[PDB]
Amino acid sequence: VFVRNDLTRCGQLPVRDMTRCCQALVPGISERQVAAVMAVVDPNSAGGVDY
Amino acid sequence: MREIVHIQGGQCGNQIGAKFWEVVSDEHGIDPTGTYHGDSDLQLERINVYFNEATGGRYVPRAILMDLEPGTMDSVRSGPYGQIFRPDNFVFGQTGAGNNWAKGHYTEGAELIDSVLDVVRKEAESCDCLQGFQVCHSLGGGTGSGMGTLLISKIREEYPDRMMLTFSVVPSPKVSDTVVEPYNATLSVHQLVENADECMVLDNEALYDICFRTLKLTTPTFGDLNHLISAVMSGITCCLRFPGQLNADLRKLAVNLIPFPRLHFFMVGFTPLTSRGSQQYRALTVPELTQQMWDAKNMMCAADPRHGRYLTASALFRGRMSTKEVDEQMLNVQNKNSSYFVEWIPNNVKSSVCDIPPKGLKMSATFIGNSTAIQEMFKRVSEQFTAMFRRKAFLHWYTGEGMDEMEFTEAESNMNDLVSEYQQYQDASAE
Amino acid sequence: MREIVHIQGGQCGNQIGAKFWEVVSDEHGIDPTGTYHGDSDLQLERINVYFNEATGGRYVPRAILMDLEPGTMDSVRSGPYGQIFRPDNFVFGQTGAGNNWAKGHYTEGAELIDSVLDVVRKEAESCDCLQGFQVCHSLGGGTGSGMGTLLISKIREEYPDRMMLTFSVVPSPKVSDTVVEPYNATLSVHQLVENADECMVLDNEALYDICFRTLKLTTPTFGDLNHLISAVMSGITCCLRFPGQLNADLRKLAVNLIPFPRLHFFMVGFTPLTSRGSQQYRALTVPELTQQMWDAKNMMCAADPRHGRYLTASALFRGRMSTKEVDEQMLNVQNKNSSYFVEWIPNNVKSSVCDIPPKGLKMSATFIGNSTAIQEMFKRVSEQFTAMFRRKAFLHWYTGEGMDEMEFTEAESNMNDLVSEYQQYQDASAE
Amino acid sequence: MREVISIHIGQAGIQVGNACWELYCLEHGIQPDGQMPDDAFNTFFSETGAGKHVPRCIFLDLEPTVVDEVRTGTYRQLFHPEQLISGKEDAANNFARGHYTIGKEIVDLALDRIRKLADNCTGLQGFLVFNAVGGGTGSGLGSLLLERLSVDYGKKSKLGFTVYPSPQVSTAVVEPYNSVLSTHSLLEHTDVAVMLDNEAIYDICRRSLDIERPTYTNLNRLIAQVISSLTASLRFDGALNVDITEFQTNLVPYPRIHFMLSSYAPIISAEKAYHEQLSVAEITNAAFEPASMMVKCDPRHGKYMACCLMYRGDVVPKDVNASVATIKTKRTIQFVDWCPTGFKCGINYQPPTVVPGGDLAKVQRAVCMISNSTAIGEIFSRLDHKFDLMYAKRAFVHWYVGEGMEEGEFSEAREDLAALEKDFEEVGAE
Amino acid sequence: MREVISIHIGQAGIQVGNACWELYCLEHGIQPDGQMPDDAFNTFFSETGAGKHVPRCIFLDLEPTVVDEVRTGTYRQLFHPEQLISGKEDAANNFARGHYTIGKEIVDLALDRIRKLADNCTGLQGFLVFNAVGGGTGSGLGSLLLERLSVDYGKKSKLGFTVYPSPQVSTAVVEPYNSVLSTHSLLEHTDVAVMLDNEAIYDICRRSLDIERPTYTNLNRLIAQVISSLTASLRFDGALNVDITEFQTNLVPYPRIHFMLSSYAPIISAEKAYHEQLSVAEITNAAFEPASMMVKCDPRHGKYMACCLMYRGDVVPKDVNASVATIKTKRTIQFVDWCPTGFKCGINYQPPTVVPGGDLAKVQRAVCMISNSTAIGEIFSRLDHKFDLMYAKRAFVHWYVGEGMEEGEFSEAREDLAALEKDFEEVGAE
Amino acid sequence: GFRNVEPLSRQERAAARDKDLLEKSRLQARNRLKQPENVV
Amino acid sequence: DFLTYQGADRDQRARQRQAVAVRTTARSEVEAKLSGLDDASGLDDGRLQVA
């Protein structure tokens, strides 16, 4: 799903794109939880963490 | 001053009755709170046929709703015109009939039937003069078919001379809703033949066809079908409620329509049914009304009149019209289609005219056709009943309610004899 | 203005009485200092049933505490509500009965009984009208059983017409506390049959079972059992103390319960007993309270009503309730469980309604059942008494007190005759 | 001018009297304090020089609780304090207790106050005795008081609105016993006895008022409405006035047969009201419906001997004639062969007043149908086997013996009730 | 008024009950604390005076772990603690252990709580028994409970959502043994038995949800959605309402033949959702697809006898009619000659609610097709040889004998399953 | 601050006094064709 | 106040009827929207414009 939503094949997605992916997987997920997981995955990044 | 006692049975019957009472209150200018807001004297002139005046200005329908489960009546009460009905006329049980004519006729319908007859008698004695009872319900359902047939038998026993009219929704030919529809229809037709003086057969698939082809609607819910049924139900008795140039009551229709006592099943249709797109394209004339009237697509019965022969046909027109026009039109119809009309009856048309058309329509007309085409519908129902009964599938559910296996075959025999009579008068030759 | 004289006997009886008076003072809004702090008129309206007015606003219980050892009433006085009781109503000997019915009835009970009757007469003469005496004590203990039976005999001699209500803690079936429980119980039951007008039977093991299964308590001390008993003692007489929609006094309960004079033994239960976890989960309806009432686990006696037949059963409901609802619930219970109810009594239920529920509870209900199930309890006590009496174990202790061996045989014969009456009315057939 | 003395004996008597006197105070405009802001109250209240009106009633009970509830409630300044009579010990569902031992001094005081009340009345239509057949107080003390009234007052019409035990549902166990005893007592003393059943009135409340949890307050409100409808002709003018003496002379075919079924119409809540016509014919049909009877006794089983109809409100003699003619032509309703008329119609122009806080609606028309019919023998038949089933084992007999009864009393009561059954069968038969 | 009592027996029963009750709470808005911020919940929940809702369910198990997981999880303030019934010793995959020795006291307490629950229900549509055929607790204790319910409650409709062992994959070894025993037991007690297979639901999850590691939580969520669709017509209004009683009338031709295949549609993840139209005809076709069956039983082998379709959401009768007409004209779908209609369509206006944390997408339409078809005999045929293969050596038979069973019980169960095979063959044949 | 209550007319008192007039008025209030007993 | 249970039953019935009325009004609006679709509605207006 992340690959389908990643148009540039860059391996990285924005917050909106990965929240969309996580909602397509599990509808109940909010954006804050996804962003928190993004931060704990990559601490210092300007978005675009590797999916 | 000729009163009619309306009865609704089952979910389908209750929905049809609610739509019908909404339509009639609209015709008579009655708001859902019961007050008159019509601004027309003829609306209040004959309001007593269907309604009774309460202590205030409220008018309550002379309607009795019967059911074994309270959900349908809760929906009816909460509908837009749910408050006009007197709350005591909602007679409901607690355990619904599981599409079981036996449950609705013998086991569970028996206890509620005395409450129902108490309400019916209370409403009937209040009537100054009583034209009769009209019962709207669906063949092929447990509480509807079962308790309807039981109540019709009881009312026939109590008031044999009074008119009995039935609006029965026969199970549809092609797409059947429940499995046990042939059983319920077989057990209900046997009762209707013996008891009901006048019976009008409706098919949901014919209704879908007419609303898809004439009305050309895209999403026809049950509301639209109930609306068409309500239109016919009003138009049959509008000659009682409104002055007519050539008026004709229910008993006159029955006398002119029924040649022999058992041949009292009729297919009905309403005109003019026009799609919203073609409303401006169509021109409202008596010939146009007759053309749509005699179209087989307009029949709300699945059986088409082409296959059979018209024994009789009543046409109740509504609107300021020419009696010469109407009579000439019906004569030309008979002469053109003499092959489809029975030879040994000199005139196969009972033409009636009412001066008050339904709201919005300059003209209208309801058609009531007694033709041998209904033979094929009963034949199809029997073709399903025999297939199920040969292997006795689902027969244990009716047996566990304590009805004899011989009763099924007796009902089948009565249906077969009725079909035989229709064929006999289809192929009867004069002299 | 219908007073009741409460008497506590022995250690168990005194503890139960102290807890009962604490519960009654809580219901009437009486603090341990005796001042009224209830802020409700109905509490003071009938406070005279149990309490008398002191010099000021203090209210003194009409209780008489009996013992041969001062320790139990020292505990009662040291308890939270130990200062309400008048010091003159504490009657004690100096040497306690070593679980010897003969010591508590003949040797040591004889001297103190004069003072006991003096206190009883002093309390009774002050009463305007006297409903009767209620005596709380335990069968199977020396001072309790012996002094209680002797006092009951004396009070029966003095006031034949006045009611006698007894709450006797019959020795438990499975786990017995003292060895001589069968002797003491056998000797006391013979006295209670002759003298006690009305008797409730309580078992410590039944109370443990109910507090383990319904209340689901983990460490239930004797205080909890005494509190259940106290709830029953209050609820049996709340109709005297509070206005009721259909009130019923003790004499009415006795008349409606006792078919024949010797069959005055009853099993009681209290509703609604709810565990902490299920308190929000349980919904309080009259059917719910009746369902908990008629359960065998709710009975505070060891004998289960299923084995026997309900001769009679009174139910005292408390709270804002429908008399139709209560009567319908009891009629439904009788119809459903007609096998457990005596045939030659058409109605086995005496329903009473009081308008004031206990504090905190929206509504409550106490049950008093006269059933032949108690026959098995008496049979078990007989099975122990005969087993010990055949070898005359521990009989010398009773003999050395000036008690004849023939009295044991007479008591056993009387108790067996009572068992025979219960069986006869269990298997009696109408007509 | 047309006084009627009200007696309320037992818990049921006092509880129905509460509703009755609430209804009377509301109907006459009398505030609960005692005074109101012509002479229509004289039937139920006597006015003093101060303008305060006191009711001509007597609340008799051996239990203090029910009387003290009235002494504490809103109607504490209305009733006479000495008129409220309280005993010390309850009768405990024992007819012997209420008739032989406790009831003596109480009934003596009751006669004293009744004589005082009657001395204040110029006329005296009669007594309205409201008690509870099935309890020691109502049965025993009520029977004793009725006997004393028959002895001293004599020919004064005593109308007993007695509450009989229901067929299946009940609250007492010795209820058949004291019911049979009280029936023996009142067969020969009361002039017109109206049967009332809690089961029947509960069914009426459940079906007509849609109260799924009916209570004694609702029952007493319905009974009070019935009694007010019966007495309306004494207080309010109207065409075809009916009198207390006239109920008897039009209703009691023979002295032994004077028990009556009672029915009220309409019984409709406010929500259900103003949805039906409520015409005279319809309400008369409702009154003749077996379900509307306030006794669990289907009138189809027997035959009507007499029917007194008491109409309230906008009712015209033409309408009542048409309705009663339809009733006569009705096949289900059947009358005895020896009474061709069998109908006593009486109209009053006063519509039934509505009690605030009650469930009954404000209806412009009302009918109270009180019928003498042989069907009433069915309830006596039920009690007659309920009695002997217990009596075979002599259950609860020692309780009655203890307060000065004998087995002969039970035998005599049972035999007299059997004779009453025989009389009902005889009058019903051609 | 439409109360249904839910019973969950064994680990599988409780674990599917967790999903079912989470789904019901989400559907009716009831928070896990017990209360929600009308009367559509009455089918599954009974409300108290405080407003907090308790489910009418009973969690029965002889093992403490599964029930304590519920007692400790989020739904600890929702359920009734006594309704959660926990045993002390597990049945250890022994039908005899769960039916003869350990199950006695547990089933007695279970009947006690079931009486208490049914006493709080005005109406009672039936029981929903969710157990696991193939385990001692579910099979043995469940069989005993069903027998007791049939004896005492009588004609109440018991719908048994049973999970038989999969054809090839399984987790137990004595699973054929206790499955045959429990099938013998439940052939004569349950009214409509719904077959479920773990292998089939695993295949559904793998193919439709694209879950390469399906698990018990996913299986239970699918089962919960199916049961919610089944009960939707009881709780939410819609055109063509279908009832628990109507299931038996329109689905059970003969009393022995009441085993039913169940199929839900659509089963799509949100990533695949809104990528197809999901019309009524397409969802009907998907529901009739053999892969969508939750039982490893190809319907092509047999013939359909009846099919009840339960539509949820934006469904119109014209569309259900067109889809069913296409199904009838379809050749691969084959019906028995003696059932010309064979269809029971029922629509509901409530769309299926989506469980947060689930894989199912928020779809506006749903179909639950429950079909009686003779193909179901194939699974019994598989177990009938899986049983006799071990029974020839009497392997593991000592385990069952040790808890008070006999070789006669195994023989009778095998013979009755053979008779059921013969009955399926006979109904399939002309 | 004076309390007020509506004064009734003499016609109402006359109607209450007369049995005939009251009944005729009630019949007129009964219903709408020809009024029942319209003519006083 | 003494008859709370009767008032509670009245309130329960009123609440149930009001809720069912709300449901029926919502369903009636939805059904009116569904049945409004007909020939007059421009379902093929775009196709006509394109042609």
Ligand SMILES: Nc1nc2c(ncn2[C@@H]2O[C@H](COP(=O)(O)OP(=O)(O)OP(=O)(O)O)[C@@H](O)[C@H]2O)c(=O)[nH]1
């Ligand atoms: N209809 C009706 N009956 C009532 C009412 N209150 C009590 N009863 C009946 O009255 C009977 C008992 O009345 P009573 O004998 O006066 O009771 P009591 O005041 O305690 O006096 P005793 O029972 O004699 O000790 C019961 O069986 C009830 O059926 C009431 O409010 N309405």
Ligand SMILES: Nc1nc2c(ncn2[C@@H]2O[C@H](COP(=O)(O)OP(=O)(O)OP(=O)(O)O)[C@@H](O)[C@H]2O)c(=O)[nH]1
């Ligand atoms: N579909 C499905 N099946 C399950 C699930 N959990 C367990 N099962 C099945 O249930 C069967 C055993 O269940 P139980 O009998 O309740 O297991 P238990 O609680 O330990 O009881 P015993 O094994 O009999 O001692 C296994 O064969 C599994 O196939 C589940 O979550 N979903």
Ligand SMILES: Nc1nc2c(ncn2[C@@H]2O[C@H](COP(=O)(O)OP(=O)(O)O)[C@@H](O)[C@H]2O)c(=O)[nH]1
């Ligand atoms: N025209 C129309 N037909 C309906 C309606 N509801 C149900 N039906 C049809 O009526 C048939 C019988 O159902 P019904 O008698 O109402 O079920 P019952 O109340 O349980 O007996 C069904 O096959 C439906 O297809 C409706 O509102 N209008």
Ligand SMILES: Nc1nc2c(ncn2[C@@H]2O[C@H](COP(=O)(O)OP(=O)(O)O)[C@@H](O)[C@H]2O)c(=O)[nH]1
């Ligand atoms: N329920 C209850 N039972 C008690 C209590 N104290 C003692 N018992 C029981 O009462 C039985 C008799 O003891 P008891 O008569 O009080 O001893 P006595 O005072 O020396 O005669 C014993 O078997 C105890 O189990 C108590 O506080 N509550």
